[PDB]
Amino acid sequence: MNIVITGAKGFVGKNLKADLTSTTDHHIFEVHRQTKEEELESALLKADFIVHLAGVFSLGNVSYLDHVLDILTRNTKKPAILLSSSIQATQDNPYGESKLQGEQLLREYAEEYGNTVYIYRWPNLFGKWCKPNYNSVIATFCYKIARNEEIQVNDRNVELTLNYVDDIVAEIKRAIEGTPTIENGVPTVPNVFKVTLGEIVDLLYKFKQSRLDRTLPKLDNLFEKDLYSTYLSYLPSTDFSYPLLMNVDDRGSFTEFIKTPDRGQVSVNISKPGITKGNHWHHTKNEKFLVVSGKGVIRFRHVNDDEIIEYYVSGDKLEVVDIPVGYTHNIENLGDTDMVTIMWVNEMFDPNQPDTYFLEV
Amino acid sequence: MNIVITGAKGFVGKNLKADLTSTTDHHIFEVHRQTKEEELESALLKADFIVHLAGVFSLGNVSYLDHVLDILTRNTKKPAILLSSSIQATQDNPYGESKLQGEQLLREYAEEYGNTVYIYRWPNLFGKWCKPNYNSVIATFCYKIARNEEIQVNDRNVELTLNYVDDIVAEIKRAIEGTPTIENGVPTVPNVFKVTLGEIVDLLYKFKQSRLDRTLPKLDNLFEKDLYSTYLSYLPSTDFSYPLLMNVDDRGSFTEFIKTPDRGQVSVNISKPGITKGNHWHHTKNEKFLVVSGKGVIRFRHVNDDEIIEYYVSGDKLEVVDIPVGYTHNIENLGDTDMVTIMWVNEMFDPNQPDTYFLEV
Ligand SMILES: [Zn+2]
Ligand SMILES: [Zn+2]
């Protein structure tokens, strides 16, 4: 079908368009405030569904929605209309009152012409293509912090009610096919978050500093997860990468990749053609060795024993070798090319309280 | 100094010995129930510290502690004595009463001869070298489950009070140097756990099945962490490794390594000498690429744009490249040897709700 998006050059617009063009077969007609009146009528008349995302001469009727509905008046089919209103319609301030006037206008128009309408009262939004140093405080904070530019926070206790652009787009796609999410008898976007400005700033700064301490976001917390992804989007195009700390010597190198306080950490060990590393055991520290290039052996020997157990392994067949506690173990490069072993460990490395003890074989 | 360990062939014994010999300079004399009376006197007389871990002719005094104290009677120096009693001393059952008689005996002996004594009331213990199908229900469960042998659980609600052998050993080492952990005026091992048999069996089964779904233990939960390490110790010496699921084709392969619900997952991508993979973008799925062998490029292009950004990278210099949302990206092998890239992703892969969209460049 034909979908027209008013305010298509906006934050939600660019996102909805990108998704719809890739995820669907529908013909998408974009409408922005620089779309000659000629095509505006064109697209509107062709329309099967209208996603009205656009905004709201010091005198005179300048309502854009009014104009749009006016033109749709000559549309054979009764295309459904989606109206993005605000939770501000409640409050009594110019912005809220304006958005309220828009709903009212649309319901009246609907009762006369019969178009099915989906009116949502969205809260503040956040997500990737929002513009910084404009209206969105989150986009501004992400953009600045990712550039070590200082930010200004008047009150960290200020609460924010939000919806992530991903939900917004998923809900619109659901309305587009007549299955909107209803709650309290009205269409309403799911997963609304209530967060403090302070919590946001902390999270953002943590995201930036996580680059250095190889830290990760708590991914089972929806808001944090969504915030992390949007933060990444405001990254300078020349700052997508960062150098890791390689510990180098004659045997090769050992590099930490990812560290977490609850699921261990993973590092990369590189061993030169003939060296052997290890020959030690642990009380409770334990690992998972995975060689992704080269070939060699991982040897074990229970502390109270003489039998040596060997595990020949290489990058051709990917297999993990657990390192059970209480066994000294070592790993050796048996090939002529560097051996690279990915190592997962159940805890952070601490030279003061190490849990590793030297013991050959 | 000289440390004698009675019951040195026991669970805590083997552990204390292993640690002390590697972590310290002290001379360790092991004493077990097969140590001729000759040396028993020998070691006891030489002793500077006694760690009494040993146990408690249907008629007659058969108390081993009584005998030990008797011999120490002829020890010039007044070596400190550590006595492992049980929280059972409270209860009124043969075992508890016995352990109570031991404390009493030691305090009386101490008041006369002046030896400083450290009396602890330990709960049930668990840890690596405990023997299965004997007294420890945890060791038995680990040993069996790791062998797909069925287990028998009469009541899952049975509560267990435990101490992990690591704590036991750390506390003894602290007493050995006169700085025992005091609580309620008595020496007491830290980190006591209270767990249900059912919680234990669940955890154990989860540990075994985690092998297949590439899952990880919740490492910030002390009991689980300790339990996981002990479970690994009961693994058959021929079952330390497991095969990973390699997705193979012409371009190379993609293998999942580690999966978690809260910190993402990491996989291993292997690319043949000239292929290119990717050419897609995501809404909120994001990654971290790290090439550990070979060389190539990671290309980016914002969806609403034409500029192509390139990141030349290889295994010589280890550097992570974040994949920001909203940019299509692809990675290509520019070398003549296979390229292996470690890939961390913020969420599990789901072909139904994929968050990946094809888009060249
Ligand atoms: Zn190790
Ligand atoms: Zn990707």
XYZ file of C-alpha atoms and ligand atoms in Angstrom:
724
model
C 0.000 0.000 0.000
C 0.919 3.688 -0.109
C 2.307 5.260 3.046
C 2.914 8.983 3.343
C 5.074 10.270 6.155
C 4.660 13.936 7.033
C 7.696 15.329 8.866
C 9.774 12.644 7.127
C 12.969 14.648 7.633
C 12.568 14.455 11.382
C 14.086 12.114 13.946
C 11.254 9.553 13.991
C 10.740 10.189 10.281
C 14.199 9.171 9.060
C 14.003 6.113 11.304
C 10.552 5.023 10.196
C 11.504 5.513 6.571
C 14.743 3.535 6.875
C 12.961 0.637 8.542
C 9.879 0.586 6.283
C 11.873 0.708 3.054
C 14.038 -2.234 4.170
C 11.471 -4.223 6.138
C 8.483 -3.807 3.856
C 7.046 -3.696 0.329
C 4.981 -0.531 0.867
C 5.621 2.540 -1.298
C 6.860 5.317 1.000
C 6.189 8.972 0.166
C 8.201 11.410 2.255
C 6.793 14.833 3.058
C 8.824 17.578 4.724
C 8.612 21.358 5.126
C 10.161 22.087 1.728
C 7.920 19.792 -0.287
C 6.208 21.953 -2.923
C 2.414 22.083 -2.558
C 2.113 20.227 -5.865
C 3.432 16.862 -4.670
C 1.960 17.288 -1.194
C -1.458 16.902 -2.840
C -0.035 14.213 -5.076
C 1.166 11.935 -2.278
C -1.791 12.697 -0.015
C -4.302 11.771 -2.697
C -2.375 8.559 -3.526
C -2.164 7.713 0.208
C -3.483 4.511 1.817
C -2.110 5.383 5.252
C -0.868 8.675 6.705
C 1.776 8.735 9.451
C 1.546 12.339 10.650
C 4.841 13.152 12.405
C 5.175 16.790 11.313
C 5.083 19.636 13.820
C 2.220 22.048 14.545
C 2.629 35.222 10.068
C 2.106 36.173 13.723
C -1.590 36.147 12.775
C -3.625 33.650 10.747
C -4.338 29.912 10.774
C -0.977 28.217 10.252
C -1.916 24.673 11.336
C -0.161 22.140 9.132
C -2.423 19.240 10.194
C -5.459 21.296 9.269
C -4.024 21.774 5.783
C -3.163 18.077 5.402
C -6.619 16.880 6.414
C -8.092 19.470 4.075
C -6.287 17.957 1.076
C -7.095 14.382 2.125
C -10.691 15.479 1.894
C -10.486 14.522 -1.810
C -9.217 10.961 -1.224
C -11.505 8.240 -2.635
C -10.315 5.615 -0.160
C -10.489 6.394 3.569
C -6.772 6.096 4.500
C -6.059 5.545 8.176
C -4.279 8.375 9.953
C -1.686 8.018 12.724
C -1.280 11.142 14.854
C 1.703 11.618 17.110
C 0.421 13.720 19.968
C 2.159 14.320 23.321
C 1.549 13.409 26.964
C 1.693 17.208 27.189
C -1.909 17.396 25.944
C -2.708 16.980 29.644
C -0.623 19.892 30.917
C -1.827 23.409 30.225
C 1.007 25.117 28.376
C 1.019 26.350 24.755
C 2.701 23.173 23.501
C 0.251 20.850 25.249
C -2.811 22.876 24.346
C -1.629 22.888 20.722
C -1.238 19.113 20.603
C -4.663 18.772 22.238
C -6.224 20.962 19.542
C -4.712 18.593 16.999
C -6.286 15.460 18.453
C -9.663 17.174 18.726
C -9.404 18.359 15.139
C -8.603 14.814 13.979
C -11.365 13.100 15.950
C -13.945 15.575 14.592
C -12.642 15.087 11.062
C -12.721 11.323 11.579
C -16.322 11.216 12.791
C -17.419 13.022 9.634
C -15.309 11.312 6.962
C -14.900 7.900 8.578
C -11.097 7.494 8.439
C -9.831 5.146 11.135
C -7.447 7.120 13.313
C -4.652 6.094 15.689
C -3.881 8.870 18.169
C -0.909 8.345 20.493
C 0.322 10.538 23.314
C 4.080 10.110 23.154
C 6.468 11.290 25.915
C 9.967 12.593 25.180
C 11.879 10.401 22.743
C 15.537 9.391 22.332
C 17.382 7.321 19.757
C 19.957 7.516 16.989
C 19.237 10.166 14.392
C 18.051 12.877 16.782
C 19.964 16.157 16.328
C 22.275 17.477 19.098
C 22.454 20.995 20.517
C 18.821 21.451 19.579
C 15.849 20.055 21.495
C 16.946 16.611 22.735
C 19.013 16.790 25.905
C 20.069 13.156 25.473
C 21.322 13.617 21.921
C 23.191 16.710 23.112
C 24.762 14.841 26.027
C 25.839 11.903 23.837
C 27.338 14.105 21.140
C 29.292 16.229 23.640
C 30.532 13.481 25.970
C 31.758 11.400 23.034
C 33.881 14.461 22.215
C 35.164 15.183 25.727
C 33.226 18.466 25.512
C 31.837 19.580 28.874
C 28.111 19.386 29.574
C 25.787 21.482 31.730
C 23.326 19.808 34.118
C 21.218 22.195 36.202
C 19.341 19.580 38.216
C 20.142 15.862 38.197
C 16.860 15.044 39.904
C 14.776 16.180 36.954
C 12.751 13.137 35.900
C 12.221 12.236 32.244
C 9.531 10.018 30.729
C 10.805 8.404 27.542
C 10.206 6.054 24.673
C 13.018 4.654 22.587
C 12.707 5.292 18.847
C 12.772 1.518 18.255
C 9.504 1.137 20.157
C 8.003 4.137 18.404
C 8.776 2.584 15.020
C 7.578 -0.877 16.039
C 4.285 0.547 17.284
C 3.707 2.551 14.120
C 4.358 -0.569 12.046
C 1.775 -2.370 14.179
C -0.813 0.373 13.650
C -0.067 0.348 9.927
C -1.496 -3.156 9.986
C -4.398 -2.511 12.327
C -3.041 -4.132 15.480
C -2.068 -1.170 17.690
C -1.105 -1.720 21.300
C -4.057 -0.689 23.444
C -3.820 0.203 27.119
C -6.570 2.085 28.964
C -8.590 1.975 25.755
C -6.100 4.085 23.817
C -3.219 3.293 21.425
C 0.031 3.533 23.344
C 3.687 2.833 22.657
C 5.143 0.156 25.004
C 8.272 0.232 27.216
C 7.999 3.766 28.539
C 10.945 4.609 30.804
C 11.071 7.014 33.744
C 14.652 8.091 34.334
C 16.547 10.828 36.121
C 18.858 13.193 34.251
C 21.563 12.150 36.704
C 21.121 8.467 35.914
C 21.429 9.339 32.231
C 24.637 11.361 32.653
C 26.176 8.615 34.805
C 25.310 5.946 32.240
C 26.690 8.046 29.405
C 29.971 8.767 31.183
C 30.230 5.118 32.119
C 29.755 4.204 28.459
C 32.644 6.431 27.406
C 34.990 5.297 30.145
C 34.100 1.665 29.450
C 36.305 2.057 26.412
C 39.379 2.225 28.650
C 38.578 -0.357 31.311
C 37.217 -2.799 28.692
C 33.852 -2.665 30.490
C 30.366 -3.607 29.214
C 26.817 -2.181 29.648
C 24.289 -4.109 31.743
C 22.408 -5.473 28.750
C 19.447 -6.970 30.612
C 18.346 -3.497 31.643
C 16.304 -2.270 28.678
C 16.883 1.447 29.176
C 20.662 1.060 29.523
C 20.763 -1.184 26.497
C 18.807 1.289 24.400
C 20.847 4.202 25.714
C 24.129 2.457 24.928
C 23.166 1.911 21.294
C 22.077 5.506 20.843
C 25.299 6.763 22.464
C 27.342 4.766 19.942
C 25.470 6.515 17.114
C 26.774 9.947 18.122
C 30.381 8.785 17.807
C 32.709 10.813 15.552
C 33.132 8.841 12.309
C 36.871 8.801 12.978
C 36.552 7.420 16.484
C 34.949 4.017 15.953
C 38.062 2.190 17.127
C 40.363 2.084 20.114
C 43.730 0.395 20.803
C 43.885 -2.531 23.214
C 46.704 -2.951 25.780
C 49.036 -5.671 24.448
C 51.456 -7.165 27.006
C 54.417 -8.067 24.806
C 57.597 -10.076 25.346
C 59.627 -12.908 23.787
C 56.940 -15.585 24.017
C 54.424 -13.354 22.281
C 51.614 -11.335 23.848
C 48.587 -11.305 26.095
C 45.783 -8.774 25.570
C 42.605 -8.093 27.554
C 39.531 -7.632 25.362
C 36.354 -7.580 27.458
C 35.947 -7.415 31.273
C 32.824 -7.891 33.419
C 32.125 -8.257 37.140
C 29.531 -11.003 36.628
C 30.401 -13.144 33.608
C 34.159 -13.197 33.567
C 36.380 -11.623 30.983
C 38.012 -12.713 27.741
C 41.564 -12.047 26.573
C 43.668 -12.929 23.563
C 46.901 -14.876 23.968
C 49.406 -15.028 21.134
C 52.267 -17.535 21.282
C 55.346 -17.706 19.055
C 56.144 -20.957 17.097
C 57.839 -22.881 19.893
C 57.074 -21.386 23.295
C 55.106 -22.806 26.213
C 53.053 -20.798 28.688
C 51.379 -21.686 31.941
C 52.662 -24.502 34.145
C 50.539 -23.374 37.105
C 47.276 -24.233 38.873
C 44.449 -22.380 40.609
C 42.210 -22.930 43.612
C 39.060 -21.470 42.068
C 40.151 -19.377 39.098
C 39.205 -21.376 36.001
C 39.310 -20.820 32.279
C 38.112 -21.747 28.822
C 40.792 -21.959 26.112
C 39.824 -21.703 22.424
C 42.539 -21.709 19.762
C 41.446 -19.895 16.615
C 44.726 -20.024 14.695
C 47.761 -22.263 14.790
C 48.026 -25.603 16.565
C 49.464 -26.907 19.812
C 48.632 -28.671 23.061
C 46.956 -27.924 26.364
C 48.376 -30.154 29.104
C 46.867 -31.037 32.482
C 48.138 -32.813 35.582
C 46.197 -33.035 38.841
C 48.258 -31.533 41.672
C 48.217 -34.776 43.717
C 49.318 -36.861 40.719
C 51.788 -37.864 37.979
C 49.599 -38.634 34.965
C 49.832 -36.006 32.240
C 46.717 -35.515 30.131
C 47.107 -33.909 26.721
C 44.641 -32.110 24.474
C 45.923 -31.576 20.936
C 44.040 -28.712 19.345
C 44.097 -26.172 16.482
C 42.232 -23.535 14.489
C 40.908 -26.046 11.950
C 38.397 -27.548 14.387
C 37.008 -25.055 16.920
C 36.772 -26.665 20.328
C 36.797 -25.228 23.833
C 38.968 -26.760 26.536
C 37.855 -26.077 30.121
C 40.673 -25.665 32.661
C 39.430 -27.435 35.819
C 40.698 -26.117 39.158
C 43.355 -28.191 40.885
C 45.195 -29.205 37.723
C 48.411 -27.482 36.686
C 48.203 -26.797 33.000
C 50.249 -25.347 30.193
C 49.745 -24.598 26.527
C 52.333 -24.921 23.777
C 52.628 -23.803 20.178
C 53.423 -26.863 18.062
C 53.126 -25.124 14.702
C 55.433 -22.780 12.812
C 53.017 -19.858 12.753
C 51.892 -17.853 15.793
C 49.241 -19.579 17.913
C 46.352 -17.392 19.078
C 44.178 -18.657 21.903
C 41.060 -16.890 23.119
C 40.905 -17.224 26.878
C 37.804 -16.762 28.998
C 38.388 -16.524 32.749
C 35.837 -16.576 35.581
C 37.347 -13.581 37.394
C 39.571 -10.529 37.052
C 43.349 -10.928 37.283
C 44.842 -9.650 40.539
C 48.625 -9.982 41.093
C 48.186 -9.285 44.837
C 45.596 -11.989 45.492
C 46.584 -14.167 42.581
C 45.050 -17.592 42.571
C 47.772 -19.092 40.450
C 50.664 -21.242 41.701
C 53.714 -22.357 39.736
C 54.102 -26.096 39.165
C 55.813 -27.617 36.119
C 54.357 -30.244 33.753
C 58.094 -22.367 61.290
C 56.990 -25.993 61.597
C 53.371 -26.812 60.830
C 51.909 -30.246 61.450
C 48.611 -31.149 59.856
C 46.732 -34.042 61.433
C 44.230 -35.614 59.030
C 46.439 -34.376 56.177
C 44.993 -36.970 53.798
C 41.545 -35.478 54.171
C 39.640 -33.007 52.022
C 40.688 -29.844 53.887
C 44.072 -31.449 54.523
C 45.134 -31.956 50.902
C 43.943 -28.430 50.144
C 45.717 -26.775 53.048
C 48.894 -28.658 52.249
C 48.823 -27.749 48.554
C 48.315 -24.078 49.339
C 50.826 -23.834 52.210
C 53.619 -25.572 50.312
C 53.190 -23.216 47.337
C 52.215 -20.031 49.161
C 54.598 -20.243 52.092
C 58.072 -21.042 53.438
C 56.856 -23.099 56.414
C 57.916 -26.744 56.758
C 54.768 -28.877 56.505
C 54.544 -32.229 58.297
C 51.605 -34.354 57.201
C 49.985 -36.756 59.641
C 47.352 -39.298 58.619
C 45.867 -42.506 60.034
C 48.691 -44.710 58.750
C 51.544 -42.622 60.110
C 53.594 -44.896 62.384
C 53.646 -43.763 66.025
C 57.368 -43.062 65.669
C 57.088 -40.048 63.361
C 53.838 -38.880 64.942
C 55.908 -38.039 68.033
C 58.664 -36.760 65.793
C 56.555 -34.176 63.967
C 54.524 -33.255 67.045
C 57.632 -32.530 69.089
C 59.154 -30.482 66.225
C 55.844 -28.590 65.808
C 55.428 -24.803 66.059
C 51.755 -24.898 65.086
C 49.252 -27.765 64.984
C 46.328 -27.730 62.539
C 44.142 -30.520 63.926
C 41.856 -31.673 61.090
C 41.766 -35.393 61.921
C 38.552 -37.124 62.954
C 37.476 -38.206 66.449
C 37.737 -51.607 70.208
C 34.051 -51.137 71.060
C 35.384 -50.314 74.540
C 38.286 -48.109 75.641
C 39.458 -44.526 75.121
C 40.071 -44.172 71.388
C 40.209 -40.358 71.159
C 42.851 -39.308 68.655
C 42.972 -35.686 69.887
C 43.586 -36.924 73.406
C 46.579 -38.897 72.148
C 47.945 -35.952 70.145
C 47.743 -33.520 73.052
C 49.355 -36.157 75.241
C 52.440 -36.294 73.003
C 52.606 -32.502 72.641
C 52.913 -32.489 76.395
C 56.684 -32.874 75.841
C 57.045 -29.864 73.508
C 59.458 -27.185 74.785
C 57.760 -24.388 72.855
C 54.015 -23.845 73.324
C 52.792 -24.389 69.720
C 49.392 -22.930 68.923
C 46.658 -25.438 68.167
C 43.840 -25.006 65.637
C 40.842 -27.255 66.282
C 38.219 -27.852 63.641
C 35.032 -28.446 65.570
C 31.476 -28.433 64.165
C 28.366 -26.267 64.505
C 27.003 -29.654 65.586
C 28.542 -29.146 69.041
C 25.253 -27.351 69.719
C 22.937 -30.184 68.693
C 22.681 -33.209 70.949
C 23.596 -36.182 68.782
C 26.657 -38.452 69.112
C 28.600 -36.498 66.485
C 27.919 -33.119 68.088
C 28.524 -34.316 71.624
C 31.818 -35.838 70.455
C 33.012 -32.598 68.876
C 31.960 -30.746 72.036
C 34.041 -33.111 74.175
C 36.982 -32.245 71.948
C 36.722 -28.493 72.459
C 36.341 -28.940 76.210
C 39.356 -31.229 76.291
C 41.421 -28.651 74.381
C 40.384 -25.656 76.479
C 41.230 -27.545 79.695
C 44.569 -28.623 78.253
C 45.212 -25.050 77.132
C 44.511 -23.491 80.527
C 47.090 -25.797 82.097
C 49.888 -25.744 79.512
C 49.329 -22.281 78.057
C 49.142 -23.095 74.323
C 47.143 -20.500 72.412
C 44.215 -22.290 70.817
C 41.948 -21.442 67.875
C 38.681 -23.376 68.069
C 36.292 -23.048 65.119
C 32.823 -24.486 64.696
C 32.668 -25.274 60.996
C 29.425 -26.165 59.152
C 29.328 -28.616 56.242
C 32.072 -27.995 53.694
C 32.340 -28.310 49.900
C 35.184 -27.822 47.453
C 37.452 -29.652 45.034
C 39.204 -32.650 46.526
C 36.267 -33.970 48.552
C 35.497 -37.636 47.781
C 32.212 -38.627 46.054
C 29.797 -41.390 47.031
C 30.969 -41.015 50.604
C 29.914 -38.261 53.002
C 29.640 -35.095 50.880
C 26.345 -34.859 49.025
C 27.717 -32.044 46.857
C 30.799 -33.969 45.764
C 28.533 -36.927 45.000
C 26.148 -34.784 42.957
C 28.975 -33.163 40.965
C 30.700 -36.453 40.210
C 27.472 -38.147 39.074
C 25.942 -35.301 37.055
C 29.203 -34.734 35.185
C 28.820 -38.383 34.140
C 25.129 -38.293 33.207
C 24.576 -40.735 36.089
C 21.219 -40.247 37.811
C 21.044 -38.736 41.289
C 18.644 -39.238 44.193
C 17.165 -36.235 46.024
C 14.721 -37.085 48.815
C 13.810 -33.530 49.786
C 14.846 -30.432 47.839
C 13.852 -28.170 50.711
C 16.548 -29.513 53.007
C 18.689 -26.509 53.936
C 22.482 -26.710 54.096
C 24.890 -24.396 55.913
C 28.245 -24.344 54.144
C 31.733 -22.969 53.918
C 33.804 -23.217 50.776
C 37.192 -24.894 51.219
C 38.872 -21.708 49.942
C 37.560 -19.782 52.945
C 38.499 -22.592 55.300
C 42.080 -22.509 54.022
C 42.286 -18.713 54.066
C 41.061 -18.612 57.659
C 43.527 -21.252 58.801
C 46.348 -19.305 57.155
C 45.163 -16.232 59.058
C 45.144 -18.096 62.380
C 48.593 -19.486 61.609
C 49.748 -15.890 61.844
C 47.673 -14.855 64.834
C 45.013 -12.794 63.077
C 41.922 -15.041 63.135
C 38.555 -13.681 62.099
C 36.557 -13.041 65.257
C 32.782 -12.738 65.372
C 30.789 -13.020 68.606
C 34.095 -13.344 70.437
C 35.014 -16.605 68.724
C 37.185 -17.518 65.706
C 34.919 -18.089 62.732
C 35.357 -18.771 59.035
C 33.765 -16.048 56.833
C 31.286 -16.343 53.927
C 29.008 -19.017 55.334
C 26.271 -19.930 52.845
C 22.753 -21.191 53.539
C 21.459 -23.040 50.499
C 18.730 -25.496 49.605
C 19.529 -28.909 48.145
C 17.205 -27.995 45.284
C 19.103 -24.804 44.514
C 22.297 -26.857 44.446
C 20.923 -29.498 42.060
C 19.527 -26.801 39.756
C 22.853 -24.961 39.685
C 24.754 -28.168 39.008
C 22.475 -29.228 36.156
C 22.647 -25.724 34.757
C 26.442 -25.931 34.862
C 26.442 -29.133 32.821
C 23.915 -27.938 30.276
C 25.760 -24.628 29.948
C 28.266 -26.610 27.940
C 25.741 -26.964 25.113
C 24.083 -23.552 25.086
C 27.451 -21.787 25.556
C 26.096 -20.328 28.813
C 27.988 -18.848 31.796
C 27.561 -18.932 35.621
C 26.444 -15.774 37.430
C 29.904 -14.942 38.732
C 28.928 -12.117 41.087
C 27.042 -14.582 43.255
C 29.721 -16.024 45.538
C 28.072 -19.380 46.185
C 27.422 -20.049 42.486
C 30.948 -19.029 41.629
C 32.422 -21.340 44.242
C 30.072 -24.148 43.260
C 30.959 -23.810 39.581
C 34.675 -24.193 40.266
C 34.156 -27.245 42.440
C 31.873 -28.819 39.813
C 34.623 -28.439 37.203
C 36.996 -30.358 39.493
C 34.866 -33.511 39.370
C 35.095 -33.643 35.576
C 36.357 -36.882 33.987
C 39.969 -36.272 32.907
C 38.916 -37.138 29.362
C 36.043 -34.680 29.274
C 37.747 -31.312 29.697
C 36.821 -30.223 26.181
C 33.757 -29.859 24.011
C 33.220 -29.125 20.292
C 31.792 -25.769 19.245
C 29.160 -25.413 16.477
C 30.965 -24.089 13.379
C 28.708 -22.650 10.646
C 30.720 -23.426 7.519
C 30.441 -22.396 3.872
C 32.529 -20.954 1.021
C 33.421 -17.671 2.714
C 34.690 -19.481 5.786
C 32.927 -19.957 9.116
C 31.138 -18.361 12.027
C 31.203 -19.969 15.485
C 29.488 -18.998 18.742
C 31.781 -19.196 21.770
C 30.147 -17.624 24.827
C 26.531 -16.432 25.322
C 25.000 -14.384 28.160
C 21.664 -12.658 28.759
C 23.269 -9.577 30.332
C 26.668 -8.877 28.778
C 26.289 -9.964 25.201
C 28.011 -12.869 23.562
C 31.220 -13.413 21.619
C 31.718 -15.445 18.450
C 34.590 -16.243 16.131
C 34.414 -15.327 12.451
C 36.855 -16.845 9.988
C 37.134 -15.397 6.478
C 38.939 -16.874 3.474
C 41.672 -14.815 1.649
C 39.402 -12.697 -0.531
C 35.821 -12.725 0.723
C 33.708 -9.928 2.175
C 31.000 -10.329 4.799
C 28.377 -7.991 6.149
C 26.981 -5.137 4.065
C 24.085 -4.572 6.480
C 23.043 -2.260 9.323
C 21.172 -2.527 12.619
C 18.749 -0.404 14.609
C 20.139 -1.270 18.038
C 22.203 -4.428 17.629
C 25.842 -3.338 17.841
C 29.191 -5.059 17.865
C 32.881 -4.973 18.652
C 35.203 -6.449 16.006
C 38.732 -7.570 16.951
C 40.942 -9.226 14.337
C 43.508 -11.537 15.907
C 44.987 -13.014 12.730
C 45.215 -11.876 9.140
C 44.500 -8.384 7.847
C 41.647 -6.603 6.116
C 39.192 -3.729 6.387
C 36.033 -2.845 8.263
C 33.939 -0.386 6.245
C 31.177 1.938 7.441
C 28.623 4.146 5.715
C 25.826 5.967 7.531
C 22.457 4.907 6.100
C 21.493 8.489 5.132
C 24.828 9.077 3.379
C 27.439 8.365 0.678
C 30.776 8.748 2.460
C 32.547 5.444 3.040
C 34.758 5.258 6.118
C 37.464 2.607 6.212
C 39.340 1.007 9.089
C 42.385 -0.988 7.994
C 43.255 -3.509 10.670
C 45.202 -6.726 11.386
C 46.518 -9.177 13.967
C 49.826 -7.336 14.381
C 48.255 -4.456 16.316
C 45.272 -5.474 18.466
C 42.551 -2.866 18.224
C 38.798 -3.045 18.712
C 36.444 -1.451 16.206
C 32.973 -0.587 17.530
C 30.118 -0.987 15.030
C 27.798 1.986 15.688
C 24.095 1.489 14.957
C 22.771 3.114 11.802
C 25.857 2.465 9.688
C 25.954 -0.375 7.177
C 29.266 -2.108 7.539
C 31.255 -4.920 6.023
C 34.563 -6.615 6.686
C 36.966 -7.977 4.091
C 40.009 -10.221 4.116
C 42.835 -8.384 2.353
C 45.533 -10.932 3.141
C 46.358 -14.333 1.677
C 45.821 -16.259 4.900
C 42.472 -16.754 6.651
C 41.285 -13.732 8.642
C 39.862 -14.464 12.095
C 37.814 -11.774 13.792
C 36.493 -12.044 17.329
C 33.050 -10.496 17.424
C 31.261 -9.307 20.540
C 27.569 -8.497 20.118
C 25.196 -6.783 22.560
C 22.411 -9.347 22.114
C 21.567 -12.865 20.978
C 21.031 -13.560 17.274
C 17.392 -14.114 16.316
C 16.530 -14.768 12.634
C 12.826 -14.067 13.327
C 13.311 -10.652 14.926
C 16.605 -9.920 13.251
C 17.814 -6.385 13.609
C 19.957 -6.527 10.520
C 19.080 -5.056 7.111
C 20.922 -5.593 3.837
C 22.535 -2.528 2.265
C 25.677 -2.646 0.113
C 28.871 -0.605 0.618
Zn 45.280 -20.847 34.198
Zn 26.692 -6.203 12.228
